[PDB]
Each structure stands twice: as structure tokens, then as C-alpha cells.
Design an enzyme around this catalytic site. Structure first.
Site: not given
Ligand code: PRO
Length: 330
Positions: A35, A199
Site C-alpha cells: 500500500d 498531473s
């Protein structure tokens, strides 16, 4: 040193991935959920409340010659999906894919919430976010990656998740045969303890690319892609009959639909998520309503590039002094 381990979807929807991990001496092999959005290595154990264990393999520290109680230390964690676990702490030898760390904090669960009990395939979690998120008190502990770092050939790990197929986690090296083209690197902020990056924009299907900054985290422990409501609305508007359902808990669409792809930007590069990856199948057995793999982050407080996005790429988690994230096609 290096390590290399295969990671395997837990079910037919790629809800999560499990990777075998050797703990203790002689080895006890547990299947852990790696994770990158948390920083605790915790396991089902001989201390876990019996009624909360249903089919998991447990770690038994009393059968390990190298286990030592970390006296006084406790831990307690809550995840973004509302699940939780807590317990005490041992140190032991932990190996992943041939890479061994001695003195790793292995957090033994005394209690786990129902979603963990109900998932018989997941024997615990191995956190790969920054160690500043680790929950052990009163002495915070290091992740497996941070402990391994100094021994690694290069201070990196890579995630190569499969679509309905096994993939790989590598430690200490970049497998140049595992991707196509170039890797595009982008800056990481560790201010919140996550692999947080920005992004450069998105496109829906064959539509034009929208240049826009989207701050979010690379999180292998989250199934879906959670993005701002504007972006998600633009995506689902291209699917006939798609709608957000408060009763179901997100966007659903007619199972008869063909989904468009979704592109996200990494610098000047573009990663394309095929439409098929965004189909999470019937909302309940036999339903003709299907659950979407792109969902709004509006109620979460952070954008999350989960497995839906990450499995479309070969992803480099560069833990050098100045950390970065790399993405390549594959
Ligand atoms: O007793 C110990 O040392 C650990 C910490 C509290 C719970 N078990």
C-alpha cells in the site's frame, strides 16, 4: 541488494493485489497488500481477536526465533474507506522477493474491522508511503522500504500491476524490459506523507487534452481513480445512461455500454487507461447496472491515482533524497 516479487489480484475485479512476504525464522509466509498510501506493516496474528479472523494466515511470533516484542509500543490506523486495525508490535526479519530486512517493525493486530475480517485473501498490509505516516506510538517506526534503502542498489521500488493478471513489485532496480518507450519523471511532495504529485491534465476517449493541474497521490492500496467532480462529470457525460447514484455510492452506468478510455498527463507524457479498466461490473450479482472505475474525490479531500490508473503504467517510486515518481507505458 534487490528484491522482486509477483503481485496477484485477489479477485476477478482487481479489487486489490497480494504479494507473498516471509516473516520470521523459520519463515512464515503471509500474503500482504502493498500500500503506497500508508506506512504501517501490519499482520493478522496469533493475537488477533478470534472472532475477527476468518481464513487469513496468521503470524505467530512465539514460533519465530528472531521475533522480539517491541515493549510498550502500540499502533492504530484508519484508512480512507473507513476500515481500521490496531494492536501491538514486534521486530522480526522480513523478506520480500529475496530482499531481507532485519529488525523490521511487524505490527500485530489485536483488532481489525469487518472489511478486513471478510477478506480472507489479505493477511495484512505492507505500507510504502513515507515513514512520517507510521502510526506506532510512542516511538514511530520505519517502513520496509526505508529500512531496506541503504542496502538497495538504487533507492527505488517499482509497481507493475496487471489487468486481470499478475504483476511485479521490484526493489532496488528498474527493469528496463518491463516497459515500452521512456519513463517520464515528475516531482513529489512529501508534505502530507504520500507519494503526492501533480498531473498535467486529462482527455476523455478521443477528445482533446485539457491542460490543468491535478494534485493527487499514487496509491496502490486504493482500487479506483478518484478525481475532481468536474473531470469525472466530463468523463461520464460521454457514456449513455451514466449517472451518479447516492444509493449505490457513486457513478454507475448501463452494463451494455462501451466505455471510453481516460488519459492522464505526466509532464508532456500521456498515460492511457483503456475503457475496459474502468468497468467494475454489476453493482450486485445479476444487475444490469455497472459500477464505474472513475469516481469523484469531492467527499475525500484528496485526489487518488489508485489501481485503475496505476495498472495502466510501469510506475517508479524514486526514494532518493529528492523523491520523484516515474511513469511509462507498457
Ligand atoms: O504490552 C505491551 O508491551 C504491548 C503494548 C501494549 C499492548 N501490548
Amino acid at each position: 541488494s534487490t528484491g522482486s516479487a509477483t503481485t496477484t489480484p485477489i479477485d476477478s475485479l482487481d479489487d486489490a493485489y497480494i504479494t507473498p512476504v516471509q516473516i520470521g525464522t523459520p519463515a512464515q509466509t503471509l500474503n500482504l497488500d502493498f500500500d503506497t498510501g500508508s506506512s504501517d506493516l501490519w499482520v493478522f496474528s496469533s493475537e488477533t481477536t478470534a472472532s475477527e479472523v476468518d481464513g487469513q494466515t496468521i503470524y505467530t511470533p512465539s514460533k519465530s526465533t528472531t521475533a522480539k516484542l517491541l515493549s510498550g509500543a502500540t499502533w492504530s490506523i484508519s484508512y480512507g474507506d473507513g476500515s481500521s486495525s490496531s494492536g501491538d508490535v514486534y521486530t522480526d526479519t522480513v523478506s520480500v522477493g529475496g530482499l531481507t530486512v532485519t529488525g523490521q517493525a511487524v505490527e500485530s493486530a489485536k483488532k481489525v474491522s469487518s472489511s478486513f475480517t471478510e477478506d480472507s485473501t489479505i493477511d495484512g498490509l505492507l505500507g510504502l508511503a513515507f515513514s512520517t505516516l507510521n502510526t506506532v506510538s510512542p516511538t514511530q517506526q520505519k517502513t520496509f522500504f526505508d529500512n531496506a534503502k541503504a542496502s538497495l542498489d538504487s533507492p527505488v521500488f517499482t509497481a507493475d500491476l496487471g489487468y486481470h493478471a499478475p504483476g511485479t513489485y521490484n526493489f532496488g532496480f528498474i527493469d528496463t524490459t518491463a516497459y515500452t518507450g521512456s519513463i517520464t519523471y515528475t516531482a513529489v511532495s512529501t508534505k502530507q506523507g504520500f507519494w503526492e504529485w501533480t498531473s498535467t491534465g486529462y482527455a476523455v476517449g478521443s477528445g482533446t487534452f485539457k491542460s490543468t493541474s491535478i494534485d493527487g497521490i499514487a496509491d496502490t492500496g486504493t482500487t479506483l481513480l478518484y478525481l475532481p467532480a468536474t473531470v469525472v462529470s466530463a468523463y461520464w457525460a460521454q457514456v449513455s445512461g451514466a449517472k451518479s447514484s447516492s444509493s449505490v455510492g457513486g457513478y454507475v452506468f448501463p452494463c451494455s455500454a462501451t466505455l471510453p478510455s481516460f488519459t492522464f498527463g505526466v509532464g508532456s507524457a500521456r498515460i492511457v487507461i483503456p475503457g475496459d479498466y474502468i468497468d467494475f461490473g454489476p453493482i450486485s450479482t445479476g444487475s444490469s447496472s455497472c459500477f464505474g472505475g472513475i469516481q469523484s474525490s469531492a467527499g475525500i479531500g484528496i485526489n487518488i491515482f489508485g489501481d485503475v490508473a496505476l495498472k495502466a503504467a510501469f510506475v517508479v517510486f524514486n526514494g532518493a533524497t529528492t523523491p520523484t515518481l516515474g511513469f511509462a507505458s507498457k
